Design a protein around this motif. Structure first.
Motif, mmCIF file in Angstrom:
data_model
loop_
_atom_site.group_PDB
_atom_site.id
_atom_site.type_symbol
_atom_site.label_atom_id
_atom_site.label_comp_id
_atom_site.label_asym_id
_atom_site.label_seq_id
_atom_site.Cartn_x
_atom_site.Cartn_y
_atom_site.Cartn_z
ATOM 1 N N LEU A 38 0.833 -1.191 0.000
ATOM 2 C CA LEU A 38 0.000 0.000 0.000
ATOM 3 C C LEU A 38 0.873 1.248 0.000
ATOM 4 O O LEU A 38 1.957 1.270 0.590
ATOM 5 C CB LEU A 38 -0.942 0.019 1.209
ATOM 6 C CG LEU A 38 -2.260 -0.763 1.132
ATOM 7 C CD1 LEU A 38 -3.165 -0.199 0.047
ATOM 8 C CD2 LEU A 38 -2.040 -2.256 0.930
ATOM 9 N N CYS A 39 0.389 2.290 -0.673
ATOM 10 C CA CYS A 39 1.124 3.545 -0.794
ATOM 11 C C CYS A 39 0.823 4.421 0.415
ATOM 12 O O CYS A 39 -0.335 4.773 0.663
ATOM 13 C CB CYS A 39 0.751 4.256 -2.091
ATOM 14 S SG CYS A 39 1.872 5.594 -2.559
ATOM 15 N N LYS A 40 1.864 4.776 1.171
ATOM 16 C CA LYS A 40 1.671 5.654 2.319
ATOM 17 C C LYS A 40 1.284 7.063 1.889
ATOM 18 O O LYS A 40 0.586 7.767 2.627
ATOM 19 C CB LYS A 40 2.937 5.692 3.180
ATOM 20 C CG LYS A 40 4.144 6.308 2.495
ATOM 21 C CD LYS A 40 5.336 6.367 3.435
ATOM 22 C CE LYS A 40 5.930 4.991 3.660
ATOM 23 N NZ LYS A 40 7.174 5.051 4.474
ATOM 24 N N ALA A 41 1.727 7.490 0.704
ATOM 25 C CA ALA A 41 1.444 8.845 0.245
ATOM 26 C C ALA A 41 -0.030 9.053 -0.078
ATOM 27 O O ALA A 41 -0.569 10.133 0.187
ATOM 28 C CB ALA A 41 2.297 9.174 -0.982
ATOM 29 N N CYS A 42 -0.695 8.047 -0.642
ATOM 30 C CA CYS A 42 -2.095 8.175 -1.029
ATOM 31 C C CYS A 42 -3.009 7.242 -0.251
ATOM 32 O O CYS A 42 -3.990 7.703 0.344
ATOM 33 C CB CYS A 42 -2.249 7.924 -2.537
ATOM 34 S SG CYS A 42 -3.934 8.141 -3.142
ATOM 35 N N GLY A 43 -2.719 5.943 -0.234
ATOM 36 C CA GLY A 43 -3.514 4.968 0.489
ATOM 37 C C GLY A 43 -3.978 3.787 -0.336
ATOM 38 O O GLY A 43 -4.442 2.792 0.238
HETATM 39 ZN ZN LIG Z 1 0.391 6.748 -3.889
#
Ligand SMILES: [Zn+2]
Ligand SMILES: [Zn+2]
Lengths: 357, 48, 80, 62
Positions: free
Chosen positions: B8-13
């Motif tokens: 999972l991307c911490k920047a977006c989710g």
């Molecule tokens: Zn992201």
């Protein structure tokens, strides 16, 4: 009085023949009639369309629910059946087509044949032992069938032989009535013995023009107990009627819901005030379609078009009706035709109850 | 996020990268032959 | 491998009179055989073996299909 | 006529598989040791290397 002058005659063994007498007496120790015999029933119908009579015949042949004997998965015991020739397919094909007159779906039989002799031993249907269900006060199949044969030193053990319900259209083992006669009594016939007429059917009116309404239909039932023949045949006839009515009533639930968008009914408003109704029903046969076409045509003599196309590779019946009325009037006429079908088969029910004592 | 679920991307989710893709990229950059790549990506095998 | 339980065409219960029809038929043949080896029966050129009355006495109707399958069906026990 | 057994019978096929002497063997493989097992196969029907007699084998079954 649509249905009158029915006559019923069983098919019995003539013991005046010495060969048959000796063979039966030394094979099955048989000296009198079998518990279950075929019965030929000839019926006269008057003031009814041939569509209805033929639909009744078709339902009695392969559209009425019926019972057979079937083997549950794993019933054929491989651990004990040592015979190399009596395969499961052959034996179960033999068992499925034994005509039975059952009382309930609870009876479970078993076939345990052991061959301790040095000669091939024939497995008959009298070797089917009832192992589950209430004890039978009367046999449900004849004991003279040939289920199979065992080589010396072989065995055949089959368990879980139950009674399975189905219609004859899906599998032929559920077929009930075999055709023996069908004729129109209100159409004259040529003497077809003459070489001038032997190439024709015999009737003096072409099928493209004739509309007979006085028929004779004779059907044979394969297994009916001797002391209750009139009780069995009547039941069969009555059963058929209900089935047809039931199926017709299904269509009666479609026309009632013409306001809501229904997949099986489509209504168009064409030009010149013409309306079109398409009724597509899955898994229907020529019986219901032919009845619907005939009764709609009778109800609306000046109809623009009507057809009941039953497609083999689509497994469905599409009834197209084009008429110069509005949608509401067309639906009213369709409901009237359905009610006519229902009352006709109710009268058939009543006549069946009245005739066979 | 070793196995059984997405990274999972911490920047977006939202989902970022499936682990077998990471392993495949590592093998492709690591002079891995097809057989040595087919067998190593067997712990990510689908429905049995 | 035996006479079918029901007629292949229409489904009349032929099988329930099958076994008897077999055995009885044999004696009838023994009545009409006549100074001839068994395996040469279909070559006698003088036989008149008719089974109409036997099947009629069995109660089987005069249907073409039913009598055809009753008469013509081979029996595996008699060849093996 | 079809359902009653007209022109109906049983059709046979054979499977003759050989071994390499002392290299190969008959037995059920295990996923965690054996390599490149066939995709979408069904190894659970094997009993001591052979599928038991009387069971129905369909496409993809070992
Ligand atoms: Zn992201
Ligand atoms: Zn027949």
């Amino acid at each position: 009085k649509i249905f009158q002058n029915v006559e019923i005659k069983p098919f019995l063994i003539d013991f005046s023949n010495l060969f048959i007498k000796n063979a039966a007496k030394k094979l099955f120790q048989l000296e009198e009639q079998l518990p279950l015999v075929p019965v030929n029933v000839v019926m006269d119908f008057k003031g009814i369309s041939r569509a209805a009579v033929h639909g009744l015949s078709r339902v009695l042949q392969d559209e009425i629910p019926n019972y057979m004997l079937d083997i549950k998965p794993g019933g054929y015991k491989i651990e004990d059946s040592t015979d190399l020739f009596m395969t499961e397919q052959f034996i179960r094909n033999r068992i499925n087509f034994i005509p039975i007159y059952a009382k309930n779906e609870t009876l479970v039989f078993a076939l345990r044949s052991l061959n301790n002799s040095c000669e091939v031993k024939t497995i008959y249907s009298r070797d089917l032992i009832q192992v589950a269900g209430p004890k039978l006060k009367y046999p449900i199949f004849n004991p003279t069938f040939e289920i199979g044969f065992l080589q010396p030193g072989k065995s055949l053990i089959i368990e879980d032989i139950y009674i399975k319900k189905g219609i004859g259209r899906k599998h032929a083992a559920f077929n009930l009535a075999v055709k023996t006669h069908f004729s129109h009594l209100d159409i004259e016939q040529y003497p077809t013995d003459k070489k001038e007429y032997m190439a024709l059917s015999g009737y003096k009116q072409s099928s493209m023009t004739s509309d007979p309404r006085h028929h004779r239909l004779g059907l044979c039932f394969p297994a009916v107990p001797l002391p209750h023949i009139n009780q069995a045949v009547r039941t069969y006839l009555k059963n058929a009627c209900r089935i047809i009515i039931g199926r017709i009533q299904s269509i009666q639930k479609i026309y009632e819901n013409f306001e809501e968008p229904q997949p099986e009914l489509v209504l168009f408003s064409m030009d010149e005030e013409k309306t079109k109704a398409i009724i597509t029903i899955k898994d229907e046969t020529h019986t219901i379609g032919n009845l619907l076409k005939t009764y709609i045509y009778e109800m609306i003599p000046d109809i623009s078009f009507v057809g009941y196309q039953c497609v083999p590779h689509k497994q469905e019946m599409v009834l197209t009706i084009i008429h110069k009325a509005s949608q509401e009037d067309l639906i009213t006429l369709l409901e009237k035709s359905i009610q006519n079908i229902i009352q006709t088969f109710q009268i058939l029910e009543k006549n069946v109850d009245e005739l066979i004592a | 996020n070793n196995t059984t679920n997405w990274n999972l991307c911490k920047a977006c989710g939202f989902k970022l990268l499936c682990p077998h893709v990471d392993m495949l990229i590592q093998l492709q950059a690591a002079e891995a032959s097809y057989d040595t790549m087919r067998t190593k990506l067997m712990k990510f095998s689908g429905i049995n | 491998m035996l006479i079918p339980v029901v007629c292949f065409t229409c489904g009349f219960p032929i099988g329930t009179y099958a076994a008897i029809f077999d055995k009885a038929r044999t004696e009838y043949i023994k009545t009409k055989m006549g100074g001839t080896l068994p395996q040469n029966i279909p070559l006698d050129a003088s036989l008149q073996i008719e089974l109409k009355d036997l099947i009629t006495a069995l109660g089987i109707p005069m249907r073409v299909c039913c009598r055809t399958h009753l008469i013509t069906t081979l029996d595996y026990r008699k060849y093996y | 006529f079809i359902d009653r057994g007209g022109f109906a019978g049983t059709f046979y096929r054979e499977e003759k598989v050989e071994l390499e002497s002392d290299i190969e063997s008959f037995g059920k493989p295990d996923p965690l040791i054996t390599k490149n097992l066939k995709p979408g196969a069904n190894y659970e029907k094997l009993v001591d290397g052979f599928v038991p007699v009387g069971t129905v084998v369909k496409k993809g079954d070992i």
